[PDB]
Design a protein around this motif. Structure first.
Motif, PDB file in Angstrom:
ATOM      1  N   UNK A 348      20.420 -34.392  -1.349  1.00 51.39           N
ATOM      2  CA  UNK A 348      20.092 -34.283  -2.769  1.00 51.39           C
ATOM      3  C   UNK A 348      21.370 -33.939  -3.547  1.00 51.39           C
ATOM      4  N   UNK A 349      22.172 -33.044  -2.977  1.00 50.88           N
ATOM      5  CA  UNK A 349      23.467 -32.713  -3.606  1.00 50.88           C
ATOM      6  C   UNK A 349      24.325 -33.964  -3.720  1.00 50.88           C
ATOM      7  N   UNK A 350      24.343 -34.808  -2.686  1.00 54.41           N
ATOM      8  CA  UNK A 350      25.030 -36.082  -2.701  1.00 54.41           C
ATOM      9  C   UNK A 350      24.432 -37.075  -3.686  1.00 54.41           C
ATOM     10  N   UNK A 351      23.126 -36.995  -3.968  1.00 48.94           N
ATOM     11  CA  UNK A 351      22.470 -37.894  -4.904  1.00 48.94           C
ATOM     12  C   UNK A 351      22.679 -37.537  -6.372  1.00 48.94           C
ATOM     13  N   UNK A 352      23.355 -36.435  -6.666  1.00 50.74           N
ATOM     14  CA  UNK A 352      23.643 -36.018  -8.014  1.00 50.74           C
ATOM     15  C   UNK A 352      22.849 -34.826  -8.516  1.00 50.74           C
ATOM     16  N   UNK A 353      22.003 -34.214  -7.697  1.00 50.01           N
ATOM     17  CA  UNK A 353      21.200 -33.093  -8.169  1.00 50.01           C
ATOM     18  C   UNK A 353      21.831 -31.727  -7.996  1.00 50.01           C
ATOM     19  N   UNK A 354      21.679 -30.898  -9.026  1.00 48.03           N
ATOM     20  CA  UNK A 354      22.213 -29.545  -9.071  1.00 48.03           C
ATOM     21  C   UNK A 354      21.192 -28.524  -9.568  1.00 48.03           C
ATOM     22  N   UNK A 355      21.602 -27.256  -9.647  1.00 46.29           N
ATOM     23  CA  UNK A 355      20.738 -26.213 -10.196  1.00 46.29           C
ATOM     24  C   UNK A 355      20.489 -26.467 -11.682  1.00 46.29           C
ATOM     25  N   UNK A 356      21.495 -26.963 -12.394  1.00 44.01           N
ATOM     26  CA  UNK A 356      21.393 -27.235 -13.816  1.00 44.01           C
ATOM     27  C   UNK A 356      20.651 -28.520 -14.132  1.00 44.01           C
ATOM     28  N   UNK A 357      20.711 -29.496 -13.229  1.00 43.87           N
ATOM     29  CA  UNK A 357      19.978 -30.752 -13.421  1.00 43.87           C
ATOM     30  C   UNK A 357      19.269 -31.066 -12.103  1.00 43.87           C
ATOM     31  N   UNK A 358      18.209 -30.310 -11.861  1.00 42.90           N
ATOM     32  CA  UNK A 358      17.427 -30.390 -10.640  1.00 42.90           C
ATOM     33  C   UNK A 358      16.567 -31.644 -10.630  1.00 42.90           C
ATOM     34  N   UNK A 359      15.937 -31.871  -9.477  1.00 41.53           N
ATOM     35  CA  UNK A 359      15.069 -33.051  -9.378  1.00 41.53           C
ATOM     36  C   UNK A 359      13.651 -32.552  -9.709  1.00 41.53           C
ATOM     37  N   UNK A 360      13.077 -33.213 -10.696  1.00 35.34           N
ATOM     38  CA  UNK A 360      11.736 -32.875 -11.150  1.00 35.34           C
ATOM     39  C   UNK A 360      10.893 -34.139 -11.207  1.00 35.34           C
ATOM     40  N   UNK A 361       9.674 -34.068 -10.657  1.00 30.31           N
ATOM     41  CA  UNK A 361       8.850 -35.268 -10.658  1.00 30.31           C
ATOM     42  C   UNK A 361       7.369 -34.939 -10.467  1.00 30.31           C
ATOM     43  N   UNK A 362       6.534 -35.974 -10.578  1.00 31.86           N
ATOM     44  CA  UNK A 362       5.093 -35.699 -10.451  1.00 31.86           C
ATOM     45  C   UNK A 362       4.551 -35.866  -9.035  1.00 31.86           C
ATOM     46  N   UNK A 363       3.482 -35.158  -8.715  1.00 33.95           N
ATOM     47  CA  UNK A 363       2.804 -35.272  -7.434  1.00 33.95           C
ATOM     48  C   UNK A 363       1.329 -35.556  -7.802  1.00 33.95           C
ATOM     49  N   UNK A 364       1.006 -36.823  -7.662  1.00 32.77           N
ATOM     50  CA  UNK A 364      -0.329 -37.303  -8.047  1.00 32.77           C
ATOM     51  C   UNK A 364      -1.306 -37.194  -6.884  1.00 32.77           C
ATOM     52  N   UNK A 365      -2.530 -36.724  -7.154  1.00 32.02           N
ATOM     53  CA  UNK A 365      -3.462 -36.630  -6.022  1.00 32.02           C
ATOM     54  C   UNK A 365      -4.865 -36.913  -6.562  1.00 32.02           C
ATOM     55  N   UNK A 366      -5.745 -37.371  -5.670  1.00 37.99           N
ATOM     56  CA  UNK A 366      -7.117 -37.587  -6.163  1.00 37.99           C
ATOM     57  C   UNK A 366      -7.848 -36.259  -6.114  1.00 37.99           C
ATOM     58  N   UNK A 367      -8.576 -35.925  -7.194  1.00 42.31           N
ATOM     59  CA  UNK A 367      -9.359 -34.702  -7.313  1.00 42.31           C
ATOM     60  C   UNK A 367      -9.999 -34.276  -6.020  1.00 42.31           C
ATOM     61  N   UNK A 368      -9.724 -33.045  -5.555  1.00 44.50           N
ATOM     62  CA  UNK A 368     -10.216 -32.593  -4.265  1.00 44.50           C
ATOM     63  C   UNK A 368      -9.731 -31.164  -4.021  1.00 44.50           C
ATOM     64  N   UNK A 369     -10.553 -30.303  -3.427  1.00 44.80           N
ATOM     65  CA  UNK A 369     -10.006 -28.931  -3.244  1.00 44.80           C
ATOM     66  C   UNK A 369      -8.955 -28.988  -2.145  1.00 44.80           C
ATOM     67  N   UNK A 370      -9.204 -29.772  -1.098  1.00 45.24           N
ATOM     68  CA  UNK A 370      -8.238 -29.962  -0.043  1.00 45.24           C
ATOM     69  C   UNK A 370      -6.903 -30.538  -0.508  1.00 45.24           C
ATOM     70  N   UNK A 371      -6.879 -31.663  -1.246  1.00 44.40           N
ATOM     71  CA  UNK A 371      -5.588 -32.224  -1.634  1.00 44.40           C
ATOM     72  C   UNK A 371      -4.888 -31.326  -2.650  1.00 44.40           C
ATOM     73  N   UNK A 372      -5.644 -30.649  -3.508  1.00 49.55           N
ATOM     74  CA  UNK A 372      -5.004 -29.750  -4.475  1.00 49.55           C
ATOM     75  C   UNK A 372      -4.287 -28.598  -3.742  1.00 49.55           C
TER      76      UNK A 372
END
Ligand SMILES: [U]
Ligand SMILES: [U]
Ligand SMILES: [U]
Ligand SMILES: [U]
Ligand SMILES: [U]
Ligand SMILES: [U]
Ligand SMILES: [U]
Ligand SMILES: [U]
Length: 517
Positions: A348-372
């Motif tokens: 990730x450090x090699x891919x350009x990510x740092x503490x100041x510009x971290x990697x942020x993204x979504x984690x999509x899941x189908x409604x469920x107590x288990x997957x949540x």
């Protein structure tokens, strides 16, 4: 159903099953999931069906032959009928497989005909040839002949899947997308549709025209759309539900094993739980980012600490116990989690990510107590181990699948269950042109490895090629393998006929029976 001598049957033969979610559809060519297929098996019957232990067995076809594994001839039973009393013929199969192949139908399972290599399918999917050029023909009303472009020795194993079930042309043509409404639908399985109340229930009733109707015992089965595993267990224990869906709640499972051990069924299952990365979307098109995410997830914590229901930590897409799987466990899977973390952080450090510009993204899941609960744990693990931030998003089942097909996502929770017990049931879904490729993964090298498997005429070369195809997928970190599922569900003591021996879990309610209690 085969009721054992001496068993006393309940007077009322009714069953209530939880089915995890509202189905995408009841149209065999518009479905792709477990909840959909659960209902489809009771309503539409194809050439072959699974027996009670999962073995491919006679469905509408009572017998079949093959010539060089390339020309398959199915002899359809003369008394196979639709629920309106009309005969099921080879012409129904011809129409049906053409409708599946036709790009205008836009089936998620259009590529199933590529997996079986039916002649001319690539050109049909590509719009180069009309669907009527598909290599299928009715030689007579009771004889369906399938012609493949190369020898496929396991071809008949594919035929139990909903996508190759027959659909009734006259209802489709007359009612279009309302053909599956109770007033219009026509079915050829053991059951008929009685009621369909979206987000409430699907009620099926015995189909008296079914050819094997004399052996059907259950008169009505209701499928509920409950996505909360806790609620499913609650309505099972209250008496409403006879068979829960096979997703179990982290909140209650340990307690259930101690409270009703005999009802907690846990059997092998050919499914893999993984985080599906959208490979065509930056920055997930960077192998370093995908690899980091794959390595920093701590499967031991998820599988043994968080879930702890008997799943096995995963390092591949195809489950290692699939028939024909002889996989090589990658070296990273033997590393320590700390070593995986450093490598991940480095990438990730090699891919350009740092503490100041971290990697942020979504984690999509189908409604469920288990997957949540699993996604919350994965988010915590990824934040701690790799410094990444994820935003969780739940979507109902049907919407969730459409989002993954659309590619309107970053990372999604995912689970693939085999359709036939052979490695290509998994591997074919990562082919660049597969209709099931929601990873949006496109590797010419991976494609070539699988194409080569039917160019050889022996299982050891085939198995080595599947192993190499898995290594290519792993090398590319197309996905994040999490665990191989176990099939865990609750089944009341009075439900007979459910063995748990089918690793595909292809249940037919026509095989079950209610014991007097
Ligand atoms: U009764
Ligand atoms: U009763
Ligand atoms: U075989
Ligand atoms: U086998
Ligand atoms: U996003
Ligand atoms: U919960
Ligand atoms: U074979
Ligand atoms: U009873």
């Amino acid at each position: 159903a085969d009721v054992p001598a001496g068993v006393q049957l309940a007077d009322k033969q009714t069953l209530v099953r939880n089915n995890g979610s509202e189905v995408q559809s009841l149209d065999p060519h518009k479905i792709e999931g477990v909840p959909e297929s659960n209902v489809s098996r009771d309503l539409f019957e194809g050439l072959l069906i699974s027996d009670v232990e999962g073995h491919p067995s006679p469905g509408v076809a009572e017998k079949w032959e093959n010539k060089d594994f390339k020309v398959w001839t199915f002899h359809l039973r003369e008394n196979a009928k639709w629920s309106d009393g009309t005969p099921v013929t080879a012409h129904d199969f011809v129409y049906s497989w053409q409708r599946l192949a036709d790009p205008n139908t836009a089936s998620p399972y259009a590529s199933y005909l590529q997996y079986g290599h039916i002649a001319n399918i690539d050109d049909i999917i590509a719009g180069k040839k009309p669907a009527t050029d598909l290599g299928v023909k009715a030689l007579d009303d009771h004889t369906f002949e399938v012609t493949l472009s190369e020898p496929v020795p396991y071809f008949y194993k594919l035929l139990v899947h909903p996508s190759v079930s027959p659909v009734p042309k006259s209802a489709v043509e007359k009612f279009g997308d309302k053909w599956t409404q109770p007033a219009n639908i026509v079915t050829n399985g053991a059951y008929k549709l009685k009621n369909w109340v979206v987000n409430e229930r699907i009620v099926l009733e015995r189909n008296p025209q079914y050819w094997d109707n004399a052996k059907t015992v259950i008169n009505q089965v209701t499928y509920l759309p409950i996505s909360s595993e806790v609620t499913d267990v609650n309505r099972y224990r209250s008496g409403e539900i006879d068979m829960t869906y096979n997703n179990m709640p982290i909140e209650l499972f340990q307690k259930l094993k101690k409270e009703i051990p005999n009802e907690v069924r846990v059997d092998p299952y050919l499914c893999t739980y993984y985080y599906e990365i959208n490979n065509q979307k930056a920055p997930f098109n960077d192998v370093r980012v995908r690899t980091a995410l794959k390595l920093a997830l701590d499967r031991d914590i998820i599988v043994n600490k968080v879930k702890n229901q008997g799943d096995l930590p995963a390092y591949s897409y195809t489950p290692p116990y699939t028939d024909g799987a002889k996989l090589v466990e990658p070296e990273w899977f033997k590393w320590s989690q700390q070593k995986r973390n450093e490598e991940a952080k480095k990438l990730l450090a090699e891919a350009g990510f740092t503490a100041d510009k971290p990697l942020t993204f979504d984690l999509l899941y189908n409604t469920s107590d288990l997957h949540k609960k699993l996604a919350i744990a994965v988010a915590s693990i990824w934040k701690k181990n790799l410094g990444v931030n994820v935003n969780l998003e739940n979507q109902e089942w049907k919407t969730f699948l459409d989002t993954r097909h659309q590619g309107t996502f970053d990372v999604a929770r995912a689970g693939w269950c085999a359709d036939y017990n052979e490695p290509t049931s998994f591997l074919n879904t990562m082919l660049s042109d597969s209709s099931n490729n929601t990873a949006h993964y496109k590797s010419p090298a991976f494609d070539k490895l699988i194409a080569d498997t039917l160019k050889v005429a022996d299982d050891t070369q085939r198995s080595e090629l599947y192993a190499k195809a898995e290594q290519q997928l792993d090398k590319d970190s197309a996905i994040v393998p999490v665990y191989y599922y176990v099939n865990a569900r609750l089944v009341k003591p009075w439900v007979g006929g459910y063995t748990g021996k089918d690793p595909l879990d292809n249940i037919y309610v026509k095989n079950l029976y209610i014991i007097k209690h």
